[PDB]
Amino acid sequence: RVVPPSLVDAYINIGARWSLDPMDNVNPFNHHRNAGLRYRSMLLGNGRYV
Amino acid sequence: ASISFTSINLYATFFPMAHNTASTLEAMLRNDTNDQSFNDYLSAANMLYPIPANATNVPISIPSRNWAAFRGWSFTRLKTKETPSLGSGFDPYFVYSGSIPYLDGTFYLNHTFKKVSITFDSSVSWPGNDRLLTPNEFEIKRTVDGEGYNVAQCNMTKDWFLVQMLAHYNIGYQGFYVPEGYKDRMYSFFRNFQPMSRQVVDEVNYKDYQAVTLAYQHNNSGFVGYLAPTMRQGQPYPANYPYPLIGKSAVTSVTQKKFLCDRVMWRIPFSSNFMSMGALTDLGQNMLYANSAHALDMNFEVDPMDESTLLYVVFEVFDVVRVHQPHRGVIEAVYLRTPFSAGNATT
Amino acid sequence: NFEVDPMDESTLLYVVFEVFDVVRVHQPHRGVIEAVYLRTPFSAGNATT
Amino acid sequence: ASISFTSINLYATFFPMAHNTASTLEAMLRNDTNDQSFNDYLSAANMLYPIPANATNVPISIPSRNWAAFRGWSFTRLKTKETPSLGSGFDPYFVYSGSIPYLDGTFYLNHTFKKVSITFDSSVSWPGNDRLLTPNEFEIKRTVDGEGY
Amino acid sequence: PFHIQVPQKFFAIKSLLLLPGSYTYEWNFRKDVNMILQSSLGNDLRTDG
Amino acid sequence: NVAQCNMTKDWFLVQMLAHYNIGYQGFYVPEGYKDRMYSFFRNFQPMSRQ
Amino acid sequence: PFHIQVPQKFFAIKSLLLLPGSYTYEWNFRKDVNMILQSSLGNDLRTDGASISFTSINLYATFFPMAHNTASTLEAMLRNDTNDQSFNDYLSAANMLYP
Amino acid sequence: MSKEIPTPYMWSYQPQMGLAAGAAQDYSTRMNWLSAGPAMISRVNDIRAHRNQILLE
Amino acid sequence: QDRNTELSYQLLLDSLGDRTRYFSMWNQAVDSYDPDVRIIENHGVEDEL
Amino acid sequence: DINFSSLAPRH
Amino acid sequence: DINFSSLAPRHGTRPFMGTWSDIGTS
Amino acid sequence: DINFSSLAPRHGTRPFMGTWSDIG
Amino acid sequence: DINFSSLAPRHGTRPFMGTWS
Amino acid sequence: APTHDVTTDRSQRLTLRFVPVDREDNTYSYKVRYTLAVGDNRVLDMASTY
Amino acid sequence: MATPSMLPQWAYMHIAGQDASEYLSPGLVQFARATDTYFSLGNKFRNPTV
Amino acid sequence: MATPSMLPQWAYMHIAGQDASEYLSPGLVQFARATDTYFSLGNKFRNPTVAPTHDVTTDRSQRLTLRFVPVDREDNTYSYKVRYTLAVGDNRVLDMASTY
Amino acid sequence: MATPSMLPQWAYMHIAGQDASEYLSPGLVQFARATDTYFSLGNKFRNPTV
Amino acid sequence: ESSSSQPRSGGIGTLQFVEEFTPSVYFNPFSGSPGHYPDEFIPNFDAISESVDGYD
Structure with missing residues (x-):
């Protein structure tokens, strides 16, 4: 499933601090720059067999 | 993904206390006046009430109860798909593996709440001594605000802001100066509260407005893929997507204001003045100056959501245990939960 | 449960739930007016979805 | 059509009376046993429930609630387009301009009701102490007399 | 359009405790846009709109 | 061993009682006062790969 | 097309007298054909092509009609602590199955 | 005759015709459940004795 | 069932030291999000050359 | 959040 | 006994005066 | 030292049986 | 009623009367 | 027999059925939730439910 | 949760306590003789045997 | 007596009553203090913490904030003046740190 | 407050209890019935009908 | 001079509900004849008709 990059480009609410409306109801801890969950993942290493 | 366990050991780390000062200690703690006492950090009676898809209100009813030693409500909103059933080992319908806000405290839907009503006996408002600008009910935020009851650059009510500041730090009557970092933790209200606003073009004042949908929007043409992360396509041409707000053909626009709190549970103390005054509140001891059992009915109002959601209300109580050992290899306890039932209870 | 007739157009059902809605209005001093608003089985904090 | 206001002005009329008569009255009605009290002519909780187009039933469920000091119910049918919302002062979907039967008692769809069933705890038919000749429900109307009902 | 809360900064009544009675409080405000706004280039905002 | 490194749990106990005096009431993160630049905890980084 | 009446067998709700009030009640029902259908040869009915679907499930109940004076006297004496109901499991068991 | 020393009856509240809306047993209290030791029979029902005595007075 | 202790242990450890100091033994390493992802502070790009 | 005073x- | 059933x-x-069921509590 | 001082x-x-030290 | 004239x-x-001070 | 002093006289159904308030259908199970309500001054036995 | 354990919790759960008609109020006993000819209230209360 | 009736239960279970250092035997109290530097026993016990029930706050017939409309307005060209006639009720006190 | 959780103020709002000639001061009642031909004030006071 | 209203009879106040309705301990539950049983612990009972009617 691929998103249009024109939906969130780099012109979105330019000049303001706003969280997108379809991102307010999205879980933000289900993100890959969650650095707590990055830590736990790589504390077990990069294999799928641990 | 599959996981299995081979070998689980238990490790005990013993202080090598001296023999004859350890026997002094033992003798002391076989007394029933020296019996150890503990309490749960968040003393809670935990209730989950479904919110149907796009429901705007969820009433709560509770039968008559002696509310001796009760402490404030706290509440947050979860998602049905993200919360597993509790009380039953294995939930087969739980097909989610992301963060579980129920158990991790990773709340993020606290900004959809819009009112809370507290009623005892179904006829008397708890905010009924006219403690609030809107006399019955706390309002969490204002939609349709023309009477200026909002704190700085967000929808949050002045009344709500006051309650929260009092709840988590006891400040409101000496101003609203920032808390110290000692008393402003990772899950404290103040830290996680972020106002925000933008201005965006309307149609009820702007007369050259065209609603162009995403497909027919173009901006940065000839340099980006068309509605896909593919290779560039098209020609350099004037853009036509966003509308200026700079100074040259800056269009009329309408402010959108909102806030976000994440990792915060909303909290209303059960206290006559919402500032904290030690663990046992003055209204927990006023159910001993008001011996009786009252019904507790509440009402909440939330934003619609397409996804099914849950309402998680922590009724704060005292979960407290007293652990005695009378004799060697004997341990026992008496457990007490105060306004919610002390035992038998829920399985 | 109310059994209505079919209508071609969208319609609303208007149900009135009759209550007492009484206001005590009294002034105990110059330039001081206060009021208590009570509504009996449906109060000002109790409502249906 | 467009309306302007220039001058929104407030008027008051006072009963002239002696300033001993006036001041006696003030002291009498500054006691809280002489508190004035007022109530609505139609004192009611007012709730609107949709009827989908071509629906034949509307279910209502109300939560467990104390019904001390409860009087009757009344009911009538309105239409979606002929009813504005008063809860939002903004209301751009209202395209009607005729007689609004919500804010004026100009009801006209009270012949489009066939039955109403009232029950408590989903197991007690309220006027079902055999009071009605058809006990478990009221019927507003029926086709076929069925022995002169 | 803006909504803002502005504190009292005067060092005699910003931490004062004020007892019962009726008082007349007035404070005046400044509508000059070179004193209530800040700029990032320090350009005059009264040679601009 | 101590989770996700070669370090032994016997050793870990000794170094936690020598740099912070903790281990008989359980292992916990030191205070900022307790462990500094040249103290154990801040400099101890486990790791693994597959 | 079947129509069946199916009892509860759990021992804490077997013969309880449930007094006035509203109670949620929820129970799960299997749809595995092997589990709920016996055979005389003990085939694999999943393999064979047996299939089942539940359409409509309701919960019947029957109240004794009782004088309201005498059934509120009874209520009074069953809402009391020392008038607790108590049941046994007919076979009280700890089930341990060993290979 | 005597069946325990029982939990008190908590009266409810109502908008007053002059009734107290009945009463019901207190179930926001222990002292009649299980799990502790048999040496707490006069340490937990002495509590329940004390609560009742304060009530009569 | 109406006790919750998994949640309550995360609140315990926010009241005792920092949650941002990671400990690999008992696996403390609090979940976080970057506040530049959730809240988007688009302030353009510094193309000027 | 913050629950209970100093219990030591x-x- | 061997499997529980002790109740009642x-x-x-x-x-009397016939057998007349219900005394309706004494 | 540009500074304040208060009742301290x-x-x-x-x-640890009352969060308020009484007043006569 | 069939009246077109107030009472006095x-x-x-x-x-009810008060004393001179 | 008793002189009607053991039986209702204010009219109540003997036989009732509670329709589901929720139904969940699945690939191997079915879950049916009901509200089982007992009116005031009525005695319900769970032996007679099915 | 409360005191009953060992011999005490065999008198609370009716494993080894007194009669089944001595746990109960004397009035509930008398109403379970009067009406137990058409509506058995008994057989819902444990009787111990030792 | 005339005391709260939940007082014996609370006292026992340390929701109210006396600090565990008046509740504990005196020998245990001095043991804990002696070995406080390497073997804490403080977190094994509870201290009751209890609000004042009287003379503190009465919320009866009082809002916790008021709004005051202007009673003067000057809408000059560079300045604006507003007056407010404050009313501080009897048996109330105002802190000016929370005026904004 | 936790003590007010009922309304004996269902007679404070006059929908039960006394009629207006019994809950009013006797001086107001005299004033009211001596001025009613030119200034009515009988509509300002609820009378309960029960 | 001026005075104040006539005595009122009705339900008890909420401040005086607490003092009139201290919790009751029944020490010999449901012992003796009916007619000495508390029927005023039933939230459906009326003692000025001695019947329990809830219209359910």
Whole structure:
């Protein structure tokens, strides 16, 4: 499933601090720059067999 | 993904206390006046009430109860798909593996709440001594605000802001100066509260407005893929997507204001003045100056959501245990939960 | 449960739930007016979805 | 059509009376046993429930609630387009301009009701102490007399 | 359009405790846009709109 | 061993009682006062790969 | 097309007298054909092509009609602590199955 | 005759015709459940004795 | 069932030291999000050359 | 959040 | 005994003047 | 030293049975 | 009613009297 | 027999059925939730439910 | 949760206590003789045997 | 007596009553203090913490904030003046740190 | 407050209890019935009908 | 001079509900004849008709 990059480009609410409306109801801890969950993942290493 | 366990050991780390000062200690703690006492950090009676898809209100009813030693409500909103059933080992319908806000405290839907009503006996408002600008009910935020009851650059009510500041730090009557970092933790209200606003073009004042949908929007043409992360396509041409707000053909626009709190549970103390005054509140001891059992009915109002959601209300109580050992290899306890039932209870 | 007739157009059902809605209005001093608003089985904090 | 206001002005009329008569009255009605009290002519909780187009039933469920000091119910049918919302002062979907039967008692769809069933705890038919000749429900109307009902 | 809360900064009544009675409080405000706004280039905002 | 490194749990106990005096009431993160630049905890980084 | 009446067998709700009030009640029902259908040869009915679907499930109940004076006297004496109901499991068991 | 020393009856509240809306047993209290030791029979029902005595007075 | 202790242990450890100091033994390493992802502070790009 | 005061005797 | 069944705080009674069931508590 | 000073040689005297030290 | 003429009460406001100070 | 002093006289159904308030259908199970309500001054036995 | 354990919790759960008609109020006993000829209230209360 | 009736239960279970250092035997109290530097026993016990029930706050017939409309307005060209006639009720006190 | 959680103020709002000639001061009642031909004030006071 | 209203009879106040309705301990539950049983612990009972009617 691929998103249009024109939906969130780099012109979105330019000049303001706003969280997108379809991102307010999205879980933000289900993100890959969650650095707590990055830590736990790589504390077990990069294999799928641990 | 599959996981299995081979070998689980238990490790005990013993202080090598001296023999004859350890026997002094033992003798002391076989007394029933020296019996150890503990309490749960968040003393809670935990209730989950479904919110149907796009429901705007969820009433709560509770039968008559002696509310001796009760402490404030706290509440947050979860998602049905993200919360597993509790009380039953294995939930087969739980097909989610992301963060579980129920158990991790990773709340993020606290900004959809819009009112809370507290009623005892179904006829008397708890905010009924006219403690609030809107006399019955706390309002969490204002939609349709023309009477200026909002704190700085967000929808949050002045009344709500006051309650929260009092709840988590006891400040409101000496101003609203920032808390110290000692008393402003990772899950404290103040830290996680972020106002925000933008201005965006309307149609009820702007007369050259065209609603162009995403497909027919173009901006940065000839340099980006068309509605896909593919290779560039098209020609350099004037853009036509966003509308200026700079100074040259800056269009009329309408402010959108909102806030976000994440990792915060909303909290209303059960206290006559919402500032904290030690663990046992003055209204927990006023159910001993008001011996009786009252019904507790509440009402909440939330934003619609397409996804099914849950309402998680922590009724704060005292979960407290007293652990005695009378004799060697004997341990026992008496457990007490105060306004919610002390035992038998829920399985 | 109310059994209505079919209508071609969208319609609303208007149900009135009759209550007492009484206001005590009294002034105990110059330039001081206060009021208590009570509504009996449906109060000002109790409502249906 | 467009309306302007220039001058929104407030008027008051006072009963002239002696300033001993006036001041006696003030002291009498500054006691809280002489508190004035007022109530609505139609004192009611007012709730609107949709009827989908071509629906034949509307279910209502109300939560467990104390019904001390409860009087009757009344009911009538309105239409979606002929009813504005008063809860939002903004209301751009209202395209009607005729007689609004919500804010004026100009009801006209009270012949489009066939039955109403009232029950408590989903197991007690309220006027079902055999009071009605058809006990478990009221019927507003029926086709076929069925022995002169 | 803006909504803002502005504190009292005067060092005699910003931490004062004020007892019962009726008082007349007035404070005046400044509508000059070179004193209530800040700029990032320090350009005059009264040679601009 | 101590989770996700070669370090032994016997050793870990000794170094936690020598740099912070903790281990008989359980292992916990030191205070900022307790462990500094040249103290154990801040400099101890486990790791693994597959 | 079947129509069946199916009892509860759990021992804490077997013969309880449930007094006035509203109670949620929820129970799960299997749809595995092997589990709920016996055979005389003990085939694999999943393999064979047996299939089942539940359409409509309701919960019947029957109240004794009782004088309201005498059934509120009874209520009074069953809402009391020392008038607790108590049941046994007919076979009280700890089930341990060993290979 | 005597069946325990029982939990008190908590009266409810109502908008007053002059009734107290009945009463019901207190179930926001222990002292009649299980799990502790048999040496707490006069340490937990002495509590329940004390609560009742304060009530009569 | 109406006790919750998994949640309550995360609140315990926010009241005792920092949650941002990671400990690999008992696996403390609090979940976080970057506040530049959730809240988007688009302030353009510094193309000027 | 913040629950309960100092639950340790002052030594 | 071997499998539980011990229950019953009941006897049953019928007042005289015939057998007339229910005494309705004494 | 550009600075303030306040009533501070007296302290919260409260017991672990009441968050308020009484007043006659 | 079939009346087109008010009554007078035939008595002034307040029966009840206070002392001179 | 008793003189109607053991039986209702204010009209109540003997036989009732509670329709589901929720139904969940699945690939191997079915879950049916009901509200089982007992009116005031009525005695319900769970032996007679099915 | 409360005191009953060992011999005490065999008198609370009716494993080894007194009669089944001595746990109960004397009035509930008398109403379970009067009406237990058409509506058995008994057989819902444990009787111990030792 | 005339005391709260939940007081014996609370006292026992340390929701109210006396600090565990008046509740504990005196020998245990001095043991804990002696070995406080390497073997804490403080977190094994509870201290009751209890609000004042009287003379503190009465919320009866009082809002916790008021709004005051202007009673003067000057809408000059560079300045604006507004007056407010404050009313501080009897048996109330105002802190000016929370005026904004 | 936790003590007010009922309304004996269902007679404070006059929908039960006393009629207006019994809950009013006797001086107001005299004033009211001596001025009613030219200034009515009988509509300002609820009378309960029960 | 001026005075204040006539005595009122009705339900008890909420401040005086607490003092009139201290919790009751029944020490010999449901012992003796019916007619000495508390029927005023039933929230459906009326003692000025001695019947329990809830219209359910």
